[model samples]
Target: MKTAWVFPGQGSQAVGMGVDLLSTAIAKEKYQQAEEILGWSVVEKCQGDEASLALTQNTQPCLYVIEAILADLLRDKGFQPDYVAGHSLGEYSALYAAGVFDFATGLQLVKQRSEVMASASGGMMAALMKFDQTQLQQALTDNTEVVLANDNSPEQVVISGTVAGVEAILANVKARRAVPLKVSGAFHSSFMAQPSQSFAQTLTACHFNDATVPVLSNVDPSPTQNGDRLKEKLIQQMTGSVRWRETMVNLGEIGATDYWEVGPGKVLTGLCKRTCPDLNLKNIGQLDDLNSL
Candidate 1:
């Protein structure tokens, strides 16, 4: 049976994310390598300093470390995913898993990505749970454009845009008792236009190979390996929604047997249960998780 590994992005990190994984020699080695590249111990950065490194600029690199450690641990167990995908910053993790880029190169790109996004504009994102989509569509008719960013599941969705737009949506949403989220930028919205252009150029010149297996990209639910297509989709993903719900549905269409979340959080796993409940879904976030696989 074929298995796919998915990686999560921001809002997934915690202070002691990899502390348990450090018990395994392989995970420790990978953490050491990441420290060498970053010149700061990620273990220390995330130990008790969540605020310092949990910000977007630092969060990108920190999340990459967690992803790298988990992927490395899983690989040492003779487990290589037949397919790989990531959400937002997790996209770099997919590239790393596919051998398209080394961990360092992926980290560098993520740093630049966060930097560019930070300099662009002041925007924010919010997660809404158990809300009526029909009512949301009817209420968000103001001049401000708040786009739906991630369709995480049928019951859970995220929206992103300017603060004004987000606030407006929150007001309307609160009236309906939808759960709200806390995030820094209006990710995957038009607010990222400037960063998208520059990041596209960077990715175009970077060396990439045909994926050894299908990579279910977030920008599109289709599985593709063409380097140019991946580059274009990534650029568009900056200002475009992540069709995770459709991506999961597409995986079902292909008859993927087992699905695993391979990073710091259980968010994707929860989505899998909600959207593809019958599929074999799990998470390999640390050494123990990899061992269980």
Candidate 2:
């Protein structure tokens, strides 16, 4: 059966994640390499207090390390994916799995990305559960600052913009709940224009190889293997909405029979279920999960 590997981004992180992976020689070596590259202890950060891990700088790279290690383990076992995709920060992991870049390059890029994103402020994001898209759009008619950030599912959408703009939408829209997201900046929206430009500059220093297997990107929700095209899409990703609901549909349309959420949490698994109920989904995050596979 054709299989796709999906990775989770920021909110999927938990304290002490990847503690099990540390036991393996490859994972331990990678962690050491990550600390050396980052000039700090990734383990301490992930194992640290919630507030510490929640920092965008810490959250992005820490999750990248864990997810990369898991993807590596799967590959070592000959469990190659026919396709790969990831949410927000998870895109780096997806690219790494698709052979677009090596581990060190992935770490360097995510480090720069997180730092630039964390420096921006005065922006916010909120998840509107069971919301109507047209109604939500209407609510934000006067507030151009607020834009839809993540189209996670038909029942769930994330809005990102200025704090006032976000609150205005929340006040006007009807939803099951409007829970605020814990993020430093309005990610995947116009609020990130400055940081996005800076990150595009950073990308110039990196090399992107054509994927060994097609990778789905959030900006366009389509499969592509051309390195140059992937770079272009990633450049625009910061200021673009994560078209994830479309991504899931595209995955099914392309004939993926199964999916493995290859990260610390099952967030992608849940999103996949909601987006495409017929696809087989599983989580390959924990150590036991590896054994079961």
Candidate 3:
């Protein structure tokens, strides 16, 4: 069975995500370790308020803890994957699953990433669904500030840049609908150039190992086992569009028969259905769900 483990990003989070995992000894220790490193209770933050959970700083590490716990549970049960990938912030979780680093290192990295991203101010993002690519490009022709951020699928595209620039695109772009994204700053676009550079310095110092299973990076849809190449791709991720649509296609191209959304929500499962309807997909969030698999 060729399985691909895909992790979700920002919007997948909900209140009380990691609470269910607290019963396990490993989960308790991991949370304590996180508190030691972060100087705050990640569990308390996750269970506190939906609004706070939505904050970039809180969301990154919180999601990492929940997703990492789920990944660890699966691996312990001998349900290892043949391939791994994650969307946006979930990319760190993917790296962890691929053995790029330990849980503590992943948590520290996300903490730094979220802190830098939260500090990256001035910009906005919006989604344009079922829009003509040519028309979208024409809209961006004169406006240098706005750029396509996430190529989520053929029917969906995210635009990010200055608030004025994004608003301009939202007003003019022909699409089924254009909705503003709930984000503090414009991510995965040129607006993140400064933060990307800053984040790269931290990434350069982190030790990454070759993946036991190939990882399909969002910055590049191609699967790779080379740790150096993976690190380079991750450094480019902040300012690079998440080529998720291509990642889905490439998963099928590379013989991924079973797909699992191993984290909090069904966002990636929904995306896979929309993009690759023929692929078999499942969601495994809680510990008990592992028994069925």
Candidate 4:
């Protein structure tokens, strides 16, 4: 069976996530190891006790814990995939699953990545739905510095730019007839251009190996297995558009029949179905999903 394991990024987290796995010995051990590395309890942050930690700073590492534990749990159950992909921050989890780096290294990198981005681009992002890619590009006619960031699906695409652009677009709600996204900054666009240089340097120094399973990179929907190529793509991915629509098409064309969204939210699962209606889908997050497995 052709299978692909997917990971989610931010906005997928919830309170008390990754705690149910405490019932399992393996999962518990992974969580404990994470606590030691981070020196902070992850379960507490998710439970809403430390809202500050739940911000981009600590949530990155917390989500990484869930990704690592879940991946190992699935592996113990004899689940392996021919391909793996991740959305934004979830890319670190994909690298872990493919053995490009161990769990600790991946977690540390994500933490640093979140910190860097947060420090660099303290702006806003907006989501423009119910419009074609071309229409959104034209909307960028304003001098507000906007860019088409994520092509989530044919019907749902996200745009990112400065807070000015977001406000300008909001002013024309009657024209847009769409809801805007509440996010930290204009991600996957040139608004982050100032920080891209240092980010690229840090990425280049990392030891990424050829992926054991082909990785469908978001920067470009193309699947690449070579370590060098994958690393290069990931570096470019920081400031490039996330071609999720193209990613699904590429995966389908490349023999991905079964897909599992391994993270907090069902957003990716829904998008996958919308993008590839013929594929079988599953998600692993809460107790019910785990029990069903």
Candidate 5:
């Protein structure tokens, strides 16, 4: 069977996520190892308040650890995917699954990424639905201030920019429901350019190898196995749009027969359901769910 694994990003996190994985020794060891690299307890953070866990710095690493543990477990069970994709921050987990790097390296990079991202302020983002991509893209092109951050689906997309810029679009855009995103910084836009540069300095120090499984990168939603190329894509990701709609389309055209949302939330699952209705779908968000695989 041609199987695909897709990982969710920031908004998918929840309270007490990764704790269930602790029932296995691997998760325990990794969580402990994370304590050393992270200098804080991931388990504790997962169990903490929603407000604390929602911070960009806290959310990125926490979600990465949870997704990594789940990826490790699935691999141990011989559940290898033919294709892998992750949404935004979840792209790191997809890289881990493909062995572009190990779990520890991912956490370290994510820690740096999140901390740098957290330092920015006065930015805003919002999710918009019931819109046409061409229309919105053009509108965004004309605005110059707000950028199309995540082209999540044909119907749903996200905008990121300064508070006034985003608010202006939310008021004028020809779309439905303007739900403001939880993040305080305008992610995936030029607002993150300086932070992206700082993150790249750290990326230059890391070791990467060709992916064991094809990774559909967020910056460019196409199958790539070249590690150095993927790193280059990641460096560009901080300010580039998450081309997830293309990622989903490419997964099917690449002959993936099954699609699995392999981590906490069903966000990706939901997107895939609407985006590609023909693909077989499943999700692994529960501890007891592994046996079903």
Candidate 6:
């Protein structure tokens, strides 16, 4: 059976996330390696409270440390993916899984990505329920400050913009509910242009190998394997739509018989279920989840 592995981004992380996996030597080595690369205690911050762990700077690398090691462990257990995909920050882990880069390089790039992303911080994001896509797009047509950050599913979409911009839309839009998020910045929109440019600069010196498994990019749902193109897709993802609904459909279109979320939470899996109710899907986030498989 062909399997598609998807990774979660920021919101999926939690305090003390990798504690279960620390029982393994590989997990320990990777966490230790991260400490050396980042010159900070990855372990200590992970064990810190939710506030510190949720900082964009700590969240990205820590999630990378946890997710990449899970990918490695799953491969070692003979549960490799036929295709790989990740949401926003989790894309780095997907690249690591596809062998586009090694663990060290992935951590380094994620470190840079987080720092730049944090530097471009400000604004707010909100999740909309039962919103009409056409209507929402038309409403946002003229609004430069706000944009659709994630087309998460048929019924749920996420938007990001300046605080006033978001407030304006929330007041004007006819969605059933608008739940504001606690994010530090507006992601996947023009709000991140500065960070996108900085991240692209950081990527110039790093080497990316053609993927051993095709990776679906967030900008477009097309499954791509070329290292050069993947790099470009990632650069754009900083200020692009998280075409996740399209990505989900692309997974099935490209022979993904099984869908798995390989990260810390069931967040991605929940979205997948809402998007593809009958699909054979599961989550492999915890050590027990993998061992039980």
Give the runs in model 1 whose Cα sits over 4 Å from its true position.
Answer: 23-26, 140-143, 174-180
Residues 34-147 of candidate 6 have per-residue lDDT tens digits of 999999977788899998788889999999999998888897888889999999988889999999999999999899888887777778898899886677877799998899
RMSD of 5: 1.2
TM-score of each: 0.91, 0.98, 0.96, 0.92, 0.97, 0.96
How much is 121 displaced in model 6, in angstroms? 1.8
| Clash list (residue pairs), candidate 6 | none
- Per-residue lDDT, model 2, residue 188, is 91
**Model 2, span 1-293: residue lDDT tens:** 88999999989989988888888887999999999999997877888998888888999999999999999999878899998999999999999999999999999999999998899777899999998778887887777888889989998989998888888888888786899998858989987888789889889667899999999999997899999899888988999999889989998989899988999888888988888999998898878899887
Which parts of model 3 have CA positions greater than 4 angstroms off?
none
Candidate 1 lDDT, tens digit per residue, 1-293?
A: 88888988887887778788888887678778877877778788778666666677777788887887788878878888888888888888887888777777887787788777766757777778878777778756564668888888988888888777877877776444444454567678877877778887887788776676788888897988877677677778888998998888888778788888888778888888999887888877766676665
Model 3 C-alpha lDDT per residue in residues 1-293, reported as the tens digit of each score: 68899999888888878788888887898899999999999889988988889988999998888888889888878889999999988889999999998999999999999998899977888988799888898998877888878888888878888998899878787886898888969888878888889889989998899998999998898999999999999999999899999999999889998899988888888888889888899988776676786
Residue 83 displacement in candidate 1 (angstroms): 1.6
RMSD, one per candidate, in order: 2.1, 1.0, 1.3, 2.2, 1.2, 1.3
Scored by TM-score, the top model is: 2
* Candidate 5: stretches off by over 4 Å: 132-135
Which stretches of candidate 2 lie above 4 Å from their native place? none
What is the overall TM-score of model 2 with all chains considered together?
A: 0.98
